[PDB]
Protein: bmvlg protein
Organism: Bombyx mori
Amino acid sequence: GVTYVPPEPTNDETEIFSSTISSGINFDKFDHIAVKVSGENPPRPIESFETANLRKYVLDNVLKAGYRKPTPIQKNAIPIIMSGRDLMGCAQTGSGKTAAFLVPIINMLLQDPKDLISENGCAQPQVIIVSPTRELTLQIFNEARKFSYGSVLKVAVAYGGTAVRHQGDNIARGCHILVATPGRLHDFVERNRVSFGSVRFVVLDQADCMLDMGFMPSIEKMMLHPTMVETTKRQTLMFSATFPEDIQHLAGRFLNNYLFVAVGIVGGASTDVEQIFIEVTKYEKRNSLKQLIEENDGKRILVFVETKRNADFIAAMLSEQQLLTSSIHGDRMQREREEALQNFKSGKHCILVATAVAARGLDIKNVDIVVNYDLPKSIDEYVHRIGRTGRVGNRGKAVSFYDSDQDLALVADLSKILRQADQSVPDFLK
RNA sequence: UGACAU
Ligand SMILES: Nc1ncnc2c1ncn2[C@@H]1O[C@H](COP(=O)(O)OP(=O)(O)O)[C@@H](O)[C@H]1O
Ligand SMILES: [Mg+2]
């Protein structure tokens, strides 16, 4: 049964703009990161939000958001997108990739307006934004409303675990910007509720994830859909912190004469995260987690685990200890997942146990410690995980449990990530 | 394994 109607998004102005992490002590160190731009005829980067040829109201929304100065990815992607070019954007976690695409797209939607089309119940969005998880899609949706606040733009969302008709009937009214998880998006496409015949911008957030074996078929069904306008007559944008060369190659099928902007080393960890490791047997992990939480009372802690099974187990373990713990993973009801995330953000619960479902994109204020109870199999997922802390120039801590019986294969990539980020390398990862 | 329509 899927009947959950999520609460309606706040139309409280202050609350819409307060959905942000305030910049931290090292925000100005973003100026010291080497920017590599490759591709034909890159337009010059902009120097400030004031000198970015943005519309008065769009600029005023950026300033309402709290932002005073663009990050490196924004300095580059903004003029690139407004020139009409395709873009692969790589930049570390917590450095403002979302606004890098929202702000200019919102600008061009307003500056170069087209009348909406919704014909025969079938909406034709001018922007499709896809992301690999439901809570990230909702987050992106709320950021789009922030930067498009007070304008005539209509943003809609589409993701699973919600009542299909609630989202469907809303989309049917028409929307400029549709933000979606792929499953629910294709559902509406195959029902003739959404069509790609008016698309001006496609955006893959976490694009390296979207292009891997798990999502590539769903990406093809969008990019190559019969209703989709061809690559030469629309813009495609792809952002991530991580981007293996083999995945970069696959991206080029959907890109037209594109610019590749990489801020710092591709796939590098944020240097604002202190990365610590504890060597432990599979048995010892439980005791070591308890110990780490005991040594950190009053801190907001995000605990990553491999299985949904272990997520449920760890939440139970910590809860029976009398610690207020939320859990988020794919076997939980959608309502519960959104409530766990909200309880964790609000501070009601200081501990959140998560599978990889929360590894990418989520922007949670004041995560003090990210704990990898289980390390992931991919270094790129590790980079994203620890990036849940240390954002926008604030400093954070990651503590990862290393078990050689499980994680030996990761050691060479960990060590490289550590050295790139100026982190000490324990003897057991050498 | 883990995300991703019902
Ligand atoms: N130019 C800026 N100045 C201050 N804060 C910003 C700026 N750009 C983005 N932010 C904030 O930084 C946080 C991280 O943004 P996000 O787009 O999630 O980063 P990324 O996608 O690179 O991980 C968000 O809370 C966002 O509101
Ligand atoms: Mg992001």
